[model samples]
Target: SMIDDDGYRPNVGIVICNRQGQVMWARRFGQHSWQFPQGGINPGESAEQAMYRELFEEVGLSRKDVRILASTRNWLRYKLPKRLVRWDTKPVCIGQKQKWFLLQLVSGDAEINMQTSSTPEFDGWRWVSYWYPVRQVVSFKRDVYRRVMKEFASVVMSLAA
Candidate 1:
């Protein structure tokens, strides 16, 4: 994980949409929470590379399974609530600053396998309306989800047509 001097982790958020424009919303493993697939960027990885890695690790989808559409023009950030911050860690990451990607599913939904990783991030998934996640994601992440959906809404609309 790359944590900058500002204590924000470098991460990527992935939003995958079907032809109907519904987004892939995933439930956290053994938890009630749901969110888009996301992961930390490795030391040498580009944001795009990290996005693809997370896309596959969190939800079984390879490069060929989805087509990249658009990304937030700048990194969007959100802070962890006080209790969630790991103050003991060196560099002490406070939250994530992410470059978000919007993808269109090019392959069938059968391509999604939640158990792709040894410790899967998500256990289940469903397609939801474009803005549904903004309201459903965890409180700490709600704002970022709202912005990501807003930025990608137009592109998703064009796809539906």
Candidate 2:
């Protein structure tokens, strides 16, 4: 797909936390790859709007299933490796620039449905250490994940207060 004018696709990353404050980490369908739920923003959509849609599209959770606790101060940008860049397309998407959110899961597993869509994105999921995903996510997004975690850490802590 073509890139947004800024050369980065506007995307949303969801960090889903449980009542105890542990975050959910998921593996992509049939692969060892792990990442927070994320997806690109369509034209004319706000970051939060895309985030709500992506949460369900990728992880099978609706807005009511999780309560948003915090969000990034600004868009965090990351670049893809040369091989992953598509030079074949005009104004190609070089990478994703995202607005990351820290959300707390308010419902039970019954609300978590990975197969809600015709083509499921995640085959398996689990709630784990809040920072665990930063250590296991794809290399390309590691830096951004770390930055977001650091930025949102205090916010997550405030929830326990």
Candidate 3:
């Protein structure tokens, strides 16, 4: 994990949609909260590479299962609520600076297996309206979700047209 001088960790956010343009919304294990697939970018990986790795690690979709539609033109950042900040860490990461990717599933929904990793990030998943996540994600991440969905809205809608 690489934290920038400004204290934001490098991360990737992935939005996967099916043929009808509904985005995949996942449930956090043992929690009621739901969110898109996301994870930290490793030391030497590019954002795109990290996105693919997290996509599979967290949701079981490999590169062959999805087609990248678009991505944010710049990083979208969100601050952790003060309580969520890790003060004990050396650099003290304050939040995440993310590159968001929009992908369309080319494989069937059966390809999404949340248990692919030893410990999964999500326990279950479902398809939701393209904008649903903006209103439903944790408050700290709402803004970034809004921006990401706004930027990808048209591209996603066009898939069904």
Which segments of model 3 are wrong by more than 4 Å?
none
TM-score to true structure, per model: 0.96, 0.91, 0.96
Model 2: residues with Cα > 4 Å off, grouped in runs: 158-161
How many Å off is the CA of 86 in candidate 2? 2.7
| Model 1 misplacement above 4 A | none
Candidate with the larger TM-score of 2 and 3:
3
List of clashing residue pairs for candidate 3: none
lDDT of each: 0.90, 0.84, 0.90
Q: Report how far off residue 54 is in candidate 2 (Å).
A: 0.8
lDDT of 1: 0.90
Model 3 RMSD, rounded to 1 decimal:
1.0
Could you give candidate 1's per-residue lDDT for residues 7-33 as a string of tens digits?
Answer: 899899999998888999999999999
lDDT of 2: 0.84
lDDT of 3 by residue, 63-158 (tens): 999999999877889999999887887789989999999999999889889987778898999999888899999999999998898999889998
